[PDB]
Symmetry: C2
Subunit: 247 residues, 2 copies
């Protein structure tokens, strides 16, 4: 069934030397055969990152791209360029782009449709703010975000969804395992009404927001939690502990 997936969003962090250390650790640590690990460095290091990987479980992804593959768009990344250097995924719709860079629902959907069409997988990020939660709107927010994408994308085969409560990102306080499980099951039921029971059952839904080496094992018995999108802990040795948390 759903292969365990651990993504590593380095965000605006890293050097050739520090990424070398991170990838060398993955190449020589023992990690399960049954895991998919996707490291996502800044664009400046994508090629270099791919060149260092020596384990089939590990691939590389980009942190954002535009909705065209080439043209007069100074400063953007292109999914074709990401493919050209050997990367396999792109993160779209991260909380930080939706907020600081005003990426709206439709922009995210258009980008997703475009990236899939070019053969690149998408780690699709969704999630609510502390104010939205406090008003009981967690599900209304995440179904709006997903509905926007579903109006443009009808096959999620090469999509991985990351549920990241915005209030849990980089604070050190994750959502409880129990709450994650419940929201994850609600997401999966909603999505089965749109994509069908079968796709719903096969779709990885990741938890993200202060996932770390310490708490990753506390989500191991949560059947609707299929892995993690890890931010800060992805820069650290405990990233390996997270990948091994269901060993």
């Amino acid at each position: 069934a759903r292969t365990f997936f651990v993504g590593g969003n380095f965000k605006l962090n890293g050097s050739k030397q520090s990424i070398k250390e991170i990838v060398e650790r993955l190449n020589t640590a023992s990690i399960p055969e049954n895991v998919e690990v996707v490291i996502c460095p800044p664009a400046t290091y994508l090629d270099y990152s791919v060149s260092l990987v020596k384990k089939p479980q590990v691939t590389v992804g980009a942190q954002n791209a535009y909705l065209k593959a080439s043209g007069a768009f100074t400063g953007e990344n292109s999914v074709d360029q990401i493919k050209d250097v050997g990367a396999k995924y792109v993160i779209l719709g991260h909380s930080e782009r939706r907020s600081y860079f005003h990426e709206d629902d439709k922009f995210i959907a258009d980008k997703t449709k475009f990236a899939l069409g070019q053969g690149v997988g998408v780690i699709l990020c969704i999630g609510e703010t502390l104010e939205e939660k406090k008003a009981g709107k967690t599900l209304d927010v995440v179904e709006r975000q997903l509905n926007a994408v579903l109006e443009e994308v009808k096959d999620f085969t090469n999509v991985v969804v990351a549920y990241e409560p915005v209030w849990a990102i980089g604070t050190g306080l994750a959502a409880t395992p129990e709450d994650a499980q419940d929201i994850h099951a609600s997401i999966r039921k909603f999505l089965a009404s749109k994509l069908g029971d079968k796709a719903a059952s096969e779709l990885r839904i990741l938890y993200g927001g202060s996932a770390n080496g310490s708490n990753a094992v506390t989500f191991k018995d949560k059947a609707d939690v299929d892995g993690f999108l890890v931010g800060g802990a992805s820069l650290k040795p405990e990233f390996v502990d997270i990948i091994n948390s269901r060993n």
Copy 2:
């Protein structure tokens, strides 16, 4: 006199193959002893480009970067990352970012201060729209764009300014050499008023906006036109002709 400067903004274009073609053409081209050439590929190719350059007049620049060097800013580029792979400049304020990505004047000023602060050179872009041109607002606009930068930055030692006739992009207007000379002379006089006449006589002010290997030579004799920020021609063999246009 000011050193002739030619920047090449690849925009969202490139592949490992094409970058190799472009750089190895420059490496073995006859070019003036003292020209400064800056090639600006997508971030995905910055390191590979630096590794292929074998010409002292040629250095590599990024097309955009954020106003902090590290942190939780998924998808951004960092001037410290640019520095780490041996690139030396960043383009800031390009019209395509000002428009499509809503980068405001103060955003650009904060980025400029930060990059110079980290020891990376800036290609600072300014320019008015067609609608602004027709309203008579050309100098009002470029003074407003520059005054925002001057709120943060008065040392333009490691800056070059590129004037982008955005009013000539697909609009059925041509930006003539005499047109360019007058506006460059006006910008220089305004900057002399703010930075003093020595700083103003040392500043390179570049022409940007539908520049090629055929028309470059027509700007040869314009005193206040110190070089180019080349778009589409920078992908082509004729970029070498532009560099040699004052020969």
